[PDB]
Structure 1
Amino acid sequence: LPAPVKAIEKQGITIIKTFDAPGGMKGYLGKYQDMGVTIYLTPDGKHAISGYMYNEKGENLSNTLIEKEIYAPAGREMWQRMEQSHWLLDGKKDAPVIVYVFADPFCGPCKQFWQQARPWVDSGKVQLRTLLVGVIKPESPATAAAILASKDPAKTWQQYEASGGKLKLNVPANVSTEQMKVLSDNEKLMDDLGANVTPAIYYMSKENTLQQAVGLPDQKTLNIIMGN
């Protein structure tokens, strides 16, 4: 390791890998308290710059590289895991913005977020894909399974949220083996993603990195979730 880069390491940076940078410069990708950072060895070999590289078009190439190499892989993986799960559709199947939501039937903020989304969902801009969990209340699993068990689960969920949970249900005698697997898989993915509270909302940034909102979003966060 070149001496200038060793000196930057002592400022609290752990190297991940080298990469090729412009202008004869050698790049080092690393982390500082778990955040990605970039170091550039100068052409002379005897200096190094810790910081952010921009190009002529004004792109922060260091941020682009950090996002591509550190954050995007795990985000794409979790996005696919949610896509392959047993989610309920709310909105148009071809709506261009996809938002995943982990929701419990006895969650007040879940219904409030449902309400917030209506202008985008009912205009075809956003589809919500709901992964039901049964974690808040003693009756949460049986009620979520009852929704999964109904003739049209996506419709029953819409009525359940729209009615504030006043929708009457025919709750089965037991949670079926298929319903237990759906709920336990969705709960596993929710726990993987680190939110213990519903709604747990996941969406993709324009840079293809996974983003999160937990609880009822404020106006700025809501508009970003919906793709404004």
Structure 2
Amino acid sequence: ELPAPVKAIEKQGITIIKTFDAPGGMKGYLGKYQDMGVTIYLTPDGKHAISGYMYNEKGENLSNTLIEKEIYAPAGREMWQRMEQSHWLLDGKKDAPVIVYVFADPFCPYCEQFWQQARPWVDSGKVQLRTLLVGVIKPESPATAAAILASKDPAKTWQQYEASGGKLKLNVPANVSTEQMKVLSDNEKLMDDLGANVTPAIYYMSKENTLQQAVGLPDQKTLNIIMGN
């Protein structure tokens, strides 16, 4: 059974997930208090346990690294894949190291403003924006989004559309094609699954490889983080 010291910490409202190997002959226990991940370390004397964060000589918070890798990283791994497998439009270099997904609607001022804010990083080749269009804000959103998808170079058309603040004139098709309709519907369901119905809904990966979200127009700090700066 569980060592007495660890059982004492459980009584403090902690639920253990699993054990793991720790340095110095110490045994580790990964757990959670509410929605917060925690690490517990059984001492060498075996009669004590420490609930806290372990750091190494290089100054790395190993407990944080573990909690993010084992508890947070897995959370949005599938979501990231679903976005990657969707019909997104490329804005920037195909080999840009930083990938950012954005669910956007044609009639969305903040989508346009975010597009402008990102220019420095996209143009430098550091970041690539992958846009998943949706048609949910205005009556004409579906048709306009489909019209963009229907153009000769959808990615370029979207870029011009955002740059113009949504004023760019478009060739309006007689109807939304079944493929365009599928893309829009599939994208809206994924957006819904991600939990944010407001556009722009921006998704990115932290330096620790965990899925992050930003809804609306990012402030300066959030923008810099989304851009991997």
Q: TM-score, normalised by structure 2?
A: 0.95
Deviations, residues 150-181 of structure 1 (Å, cap 9, x unaligned): 11110110111111111122222322221122
Distance in 2 (alpha carbons) for counterparts of 1:43 and 1:152: 65
Query: Where do 5+ consecutive residues of structure 2 fail to align?
Result: none
Distance in 2 (alpha carbons) for counterparts of 1:173 and 1:31: 55
Query: Offset of 1:74 from its aligned partner?
Result: 2.6
Deviations, residues 12-68 of structure 1 (Å, cap 9, x unaligned): 211111111111111111111212111111122221111101111111110111111
Deviations, residues 79-121 of structure 1 (Å, cap 9, x unaligned): 2221111100111112221111110111110000001011111
Query: Where do 5+ consecutive residues of structure 1 fail to align?
Result: none
Q: Which region of structure 1 is more displaced relative to structure 2, 75-84 or 112-121?
A: 75-84
Aligned-residue RMSD, C-alpha: 1.3
Deviations, residues 123-161 of structure 1 (Å, cap 9, x unaligned): 222111101111112221121111111111101101111
Q: Which runs of 4+ in 1 moved over 6 A?
A: none
Distance in 2 (alpha carbons) for counterparts of 1:35 and 1:191: 25
Structure 2 matches for 1:88-99, cutoff 5 A? 88-99=89-100
Distance in 2 (alpha carbons) for counterparts of 1:212 and 1:96: 18
Distance in 1 (alpha carbons) for counterparts of 2:100 and 2:191: 14
Q: TM-score, normalised by structure 1?
A: 0.95
Residue of structure 1 equivalent to 2:215: 214
Distance in 2 (alpha carbons) for counterparts of 1:63 and 1:211: 16
Residue of structure 1 equivalent to 2:146: 145
Equivalenced residues, count:
228
Distance in 2 (alpha carbons) for counterparts of 1:135 and 1:2: 55
Q: Percent identity?
A: 99
Distance in 1 (alpha carbons) for counterparts of 2:124 and 2:26: 49
Deviations, residues 163-209 of structure 1 (Å, cap 9, x unaligned): 11111222223222211221122112212221121111111111111
- SS class of match (1:113): helix
- SS class of match (1:160): helix
Query: Offset of 1:77 from its aligned partner?
Result: 2.4
